[PDB]
Amino acid sequence: MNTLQLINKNHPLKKNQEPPHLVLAPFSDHDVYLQPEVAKQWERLVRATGLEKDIRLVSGYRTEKEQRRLWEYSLKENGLAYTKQFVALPGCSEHQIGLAIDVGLKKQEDDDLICPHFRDSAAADLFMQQMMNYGFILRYPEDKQEITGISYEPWHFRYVGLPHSQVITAQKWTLEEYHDYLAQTVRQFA
Amino acid sequence: MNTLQLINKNHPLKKNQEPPHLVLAPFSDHDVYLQPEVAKQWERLVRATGLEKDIRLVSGYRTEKEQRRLWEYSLKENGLAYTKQFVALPGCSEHQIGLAIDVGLKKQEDDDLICPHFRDSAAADLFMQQMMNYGFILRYPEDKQEITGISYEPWHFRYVGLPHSQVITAQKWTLEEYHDYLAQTVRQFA
Ligand SMILES: [Cl-]
Ligand SMILES: [Cl-]
Numbered sequence A, B: 001m002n003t004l005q006l007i008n009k010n011h012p013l014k015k016n017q018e019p020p021h022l023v024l025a026p027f028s029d030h031d032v033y034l035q036p037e038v039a040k041q042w043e044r045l046v047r048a049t050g051l052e053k054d055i056r057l058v059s060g061y062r063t064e065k066e067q068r069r070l071w072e073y074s075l076k077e078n079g080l081a082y083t084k085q086f087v088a089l090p091g092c093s094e095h096q097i098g099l100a101i102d103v104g105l106k107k108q109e110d111d112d113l114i115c116p117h118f119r120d121s122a123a124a125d126l127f128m129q130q131m132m133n134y135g136f137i138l139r140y141p142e143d144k145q146e147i148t149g150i151s152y153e154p155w156h157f158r159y160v161g162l163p164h165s166q167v168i169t170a171q172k173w174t175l176e177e178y179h180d181y182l183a184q185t186v187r188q189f190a
């Protein structure tokens, strides 16, 4: 239930953690599933930006087995080096808690894993202006690979909710940096 | 492993039946999973027809929960009448065995996600002329609603493999009629 939960290579998904409730998300060519609050905020964000005809939900919730099959597919498709840069290991993906979304342009053949498209597009620029106001952050920003362990991905967004998304974005932080900031702040009251 | 398995209202998926092996399917924005054999033939089909740019893979394998979320979304958004005609009940969908695909055109706006636009195109016409040569049948043909329990779905295709797909298509049969045909045929040898 913790919308701030940190999931990466060093902090894998809890095996004792209960699977989140999921609903079918709107504005998607495929059947994408997300947590209710995330799906609702995603819909509000699209309608508020007027991007119903320009952006689409490419990916959402993925099970550990689906994340594994994705990783294996990328391995044969793009190699080990590229896969490790853009695809998280099974159990270390925030897609597995239904808080992560992959966004792509409405017109497109290839997803940004193949031939990057979303970056610096008209739809992206307007999306980047309001996304933090609806609980979303850019999960893997540019020049942050050292901290996140993942290369720059302008199409991957993470729901953390308000006002966390506004705070993180304004400081140009990552979720890792946000947790370190929170950890340090708590120790001041100790 | 039984590509001819009949799944409908009258013949629900056994709850103790193990899920099929699954791989990520191409031409699906890295989001749709299918039976390995199905994904292979799906790839060979779209490659031979040269529709890589024209058509997309909307949906494939869906768990019972995912089928439920799909049903509940449709009911809330489109109403009961619409949902009955085009959405199979949870536990009675052939998407749950990874042999069913929902195909849509990359070439059109909007969603109509439950009934993807796949009819008025020349790409659709070409698809309908070669699909049976790669193991696929049109699962819910026109004027077959009384037999299938599902309205006309030009977007939904079922993998049965060769030569079953050719036999069924040539006779313009449904999977239900095919099973009745096999049943009557076997009893001639009794
Ligand atoms: Cl699964
Ligand atoms: Cl390699």
Ligand SMILES: [Cl-]
Residues within 6 Å of the ligand: A008, A010, A176
């Ligand atoms: Cl860390």
Ligand SMILES: [Cl-]
Residues within 6 Å of the ligand: A065, B021, B022
């Ligand atoms: Cl598997």
Ligand SMILES: [Cl-]
Residues within 6 Å of the ligand: B141, B142, B143, B144, B145, B151, B152
């Ligand atoms: Cl009909």
Ligand SMILES: [Cl-]
Residues within 6 Å of the ligand: B010, B176
């Ligand atoms: Cl029957």
Ligand SMILES: [Cu+2]
Residues within 6 Å of the ligand: A059, A095, A100, A101, A102, A155, A156, A157
């Ligand atoms: Cu992602």
Ligand SMILES: [Cu+2]
Residues within 6 Å of the ligand: B059, B095, B100, B101, B102, B156, B157
């Ligand atoms: Cu279907």
Ligand SMILES: [Mg+2]
Residues within 6 Å of the ligand: A062, A063, A066, B063, B066
């Ligand atoms: Mg799934």
